[PDB]
Amino acid sequence: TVAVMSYSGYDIEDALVLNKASLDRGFGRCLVYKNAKCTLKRYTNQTFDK
């Protein structure tokens, strides 16, 4: 729900105002997923990793 009107001071050129109750209820919940991969191999000799 959007209300096109000026508020106290925080809708300057592109700023938008949020609702604390709505944010607590869960409007706009995001999740980030990062990958961490590691490969491990042998060598031409009999040396190894552990």
Residues found near other proteins in the complex (CB under 8 A): 1, 5-9, 19, 21-22, 25-27
- Report in angstroms how near the CB of residue 44 gets to other proteins at its nearest: 19
Question: Residue 32 in contact with residue 26, Cβ under 8 Å?
Answer: no
- Report in angstroms how near the CB of residue 47 gets to other proteins at its nearest: 14
Q: Judged by CB, which is closer to other proteins: 25, or 41?
A: 25
- Report the candidate in 27, 49, 25 with the shortest Cα–Cα distance to residue 38: 49
Alpha helix positions (H), 1-50: 20-25
Q: Judged by CB, which is closer to other proteins: 25, or 34?
A: 25
